[PDB]
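Minutes, project huddle
Topic: does the predicted pose make sense with magnesium ion bound?
PN asked that the exact inputs be recorded in the minutes so nobody has to dig through chat later. Recorded below.
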Amino acid sequence: SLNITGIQSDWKVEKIEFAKLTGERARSAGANGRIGVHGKSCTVDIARITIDGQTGYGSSIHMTPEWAEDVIGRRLLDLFDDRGRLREAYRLQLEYPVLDWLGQRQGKPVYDLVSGAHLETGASLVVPCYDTSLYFDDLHLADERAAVALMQEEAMQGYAKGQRHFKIKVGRGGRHMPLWEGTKRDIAIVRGISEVAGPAGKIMIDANNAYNLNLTKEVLAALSDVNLYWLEEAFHEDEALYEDLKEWLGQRGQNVLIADGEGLASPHLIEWATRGRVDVLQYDIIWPGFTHWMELGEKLDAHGLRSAPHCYGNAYGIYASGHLSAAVRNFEFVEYDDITIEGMDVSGYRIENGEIHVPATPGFGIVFDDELVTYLINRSGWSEGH
Ligand SMILES: [Mg+2]
Ligand SMILES: [Mg+2]
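Predicted holo structure (tokens), as shared on screen:
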């Protein structure tokens, strides 16, 4: 719900520029339930848009130079819905540099533009987040007691930077380790980090589909004392099996929410959530993205369902995610991964008390190095202009 009234029909997309910014993760990410080592290396595709002689910056995907050629000249006021929402056709490619621009021009943070009546203007935005960096980093260790320590120490690194909530990767038995040994190792790791997290610490687990329903039940029973907040993708989403699991957790009065949605989602996932089998929805912050999320969040709140936008692989989305919490009431967490992108200043954001602090600086509050971006655009990227 952007405000198209302040927008003039004079304002025109004048130049689109593309660059892939690169970085490192603070600590290398290992394997998950289904695939191998993730690594330390990170990249982000960013577009730089010029309207009315002012530059916007932001994430951009599925945009080839020929996509850009076509959009040049167009009125900014044209790419928007009647209700003040970027048209679908431009959503992935330009939604982020466009929104950034809007804030830059208006001298306002994007979250103020998209504001709900649940939050108020002048009041700071501080959003809960969680540490998502706990991968299968123990697979070189035969000694279960060693593995726990390594995982606890990784968690302490996050605790030291202000993280108080932890998503722990599970499903070691699915592919990478013998099923039983792996499964046991999954439990001992979660038990291990749960100490290191303390009692107020929220623990999430994510199996990246490496379980079935009896494995999940076996795992959850071995964690009934752990402050388990949610359980993410125990197996690919199936209503019947989740209907069996909610009722199972109900019997035992064990309060774990069920989260799902990332990747190639079941096209009936939402409906399954409205029939009460999935509590938390996890579509990616880049794809389908911000504008979709804004539309989706609303429906989700009407149903008293929860919004947890997936984010991993793209640092930029962490910061975007935070802004979205202003447009959705039942927003859950910012999926935080500690990454440093060259040319991408995020120091205006702060991590404290298991919470992310969103700056009042215009747009998405990220300061990009105009120069190195211009250096990268020229070196390996591209430009389209009049
Ligand atoms: Mg996941
Ligand atoms: Mg799934």
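Observations noted during the meeting:
- The chain is about 30% helix and 25% strand.
- The CA atoms of residues 260 and 279 lie 9 Å apart.
No decisions taken; revisit at the next huddle.
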